[PDB]
Amino acid sequence: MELKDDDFEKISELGAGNGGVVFKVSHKPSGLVMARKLIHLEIKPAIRNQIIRELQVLHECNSPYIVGFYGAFYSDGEISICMEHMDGGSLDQVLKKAGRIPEQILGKVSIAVIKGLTYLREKHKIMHRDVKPSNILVNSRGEIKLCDFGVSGQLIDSMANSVGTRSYMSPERLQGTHYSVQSDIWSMGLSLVEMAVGRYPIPPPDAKELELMFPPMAIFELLDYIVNEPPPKLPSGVFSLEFQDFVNKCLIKNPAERADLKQLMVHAFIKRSDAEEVDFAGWLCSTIGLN
Numbered sequence: 517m518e519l520k521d522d523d524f525e526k527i528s529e530l531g532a533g534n535g536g537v538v539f540k541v542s543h544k545p546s547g548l549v550m551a552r553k554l555i556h557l558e559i560k561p562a563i564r565n566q567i568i569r570e571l572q573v574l575h576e577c578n579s580p581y582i583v584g585f586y587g588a589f590y591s592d593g594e595i596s597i598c599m600e601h602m603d604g605g606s607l608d609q610v611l612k613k614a615g616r617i618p619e620q621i622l623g624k625v626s627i628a629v630i631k632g633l634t635y636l637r638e639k640h641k642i643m644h645r646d647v648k649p650s651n652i653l654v655n656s657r658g659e660i661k662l663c664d665f666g667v668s669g670q671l672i673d674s675m676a677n678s679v680g681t682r683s684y685m686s687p688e689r690l691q692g693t694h695y696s697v698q699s700d701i702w703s704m705g706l707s708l709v710e711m712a713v714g715r716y717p718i719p720p721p722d723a724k725e726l727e728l729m730f731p732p733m734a735i736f737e738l739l740d741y742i743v744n745e746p747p748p749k750l751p752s753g754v755f756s757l758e759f760q761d762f763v764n765k766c767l768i769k770n771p772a773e774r775a776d777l778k779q780l781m782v783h784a785f786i787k788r789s790d791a792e793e794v795d796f797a798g799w800l801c802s803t804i805g806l807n
């Protein structure tokens with residue numbers, strides 16, 4: 517069934533950020549609760565049709581590790597993407613409420629991210645391009661799913677400009693055009709360290725700030741750090757050697773030396789997490805108040 521603007525009714529706002537705002541909406545004709553992302557783009561009709569056209573491939577991105585798509589359309593200066601509502605939010609949200617995220621949980625997340633990236637690359641030859649904690653969604657059934665990946669090339673173009681004071685970009689992507697899918701591996705590694713530790717891990721915590729857990733940077737100052745200083749590490753002692761090596765291999769500055777999806781999928785840490793009996797659903801609601 518096709519989706520139009522007037523068949524929707526707003527319920528609440530799930531949040532916003534940089535070029536988009538997403539609402540919890542009711543799709544009146546079907547009764548479904550959806551998440552509807554609005555993206556403002558002053559752009560000619562010819563290209564917006566192509567964006568809408570390109571976004572349709574989301575209809576065949578079906579995976580337990582990828583957020584469900586309902587449909588895409590154009591309202592007034594607004595491109596709408598309608599998706600599965602994830603009643604548990606983004607990992608960046610659960611991080612706030614949780615402080616830190618336990619290694620074993622992070623292990624299940626790692627599993628989901630790899631399978632998600634693998635699915636998108638394997639079955640669609642598509643690179644994510646924006647891996648970070650806000651674009652990993654979770655829900656009360658304990659599903660862990662990726663969103664906001666770069667499915668439409670023209671959207672990639674039309675969003676080219678508009679970034680902030682926290683980069684999840686690989687150093688190769690920061691420095692030039694010589695980047696690709698290995699960049700997502702970096703984005704993952706960093707995200708993990710962040711969720712693991714309780715904050716964006718650059719710059720890395722001083723001697724003091726570390727034993728406590730257990731000013732914001734200038735733009736250039738931060739990017740300069742990412743590309744020229746050694747990458748962040750999981751602090752020793754509080755995380756299994758397995759986890760440490762995993763993130764370490766994810767955060768190699770040289771993208772050709774950096775681990776790939778193939779390799780991470782059979783890494784000691786994944787295989788260990790793969791076996792671990794973890795009630796992720798239970799932990800989720802427990803730490804954010806719910807079911």
Ligand SMILES: Nc1ncnc2c1ncn2[C@@H]1O[C@H](COP(=O)(O)OP(=O)(O)NP(=O)(O)O)[C@@H](O)[C@H]1O
Pocket residue numbers: 530531532533534535536537538551583599600601602603605606608609646650651653663664
């Ligand atoms: N399908 C969804 N279900 C539930 N909540 C969602 C969904 N999609 C997005 N959200 C929420 O909307 C918030 C903002 O979304 P979004 O416009 O993609 O920006 P962001 O990921 O937060 N930061 P940025 O990537 O810099 O734009 C996210 O942090 C989520 O909390």
Ligand SMILES: Cn1cnc2c(F)c(Nc3ccc(Br)cc3Cl)c(C(=O)NOCCO)cc21
Pocket residue numbers: 533534535536537553555571574582583584585597599646662663664665666667668669671672675
């Ligand atoms: C660059 N680019 C190319 N295609 C894209 C695309 F489809 C996007 N959205 C999206 C994708 C899959 C699913 Br499932 C759900 C959504 Cl909402 C986003 C995106 O929403 N970036 O979020 C930034 C903040 O608003 C970006 C895309």
Ligand SMILES: [Mg+2]
Pocket residue numbers: 650651664
């Ligand atoms: Mg986003």
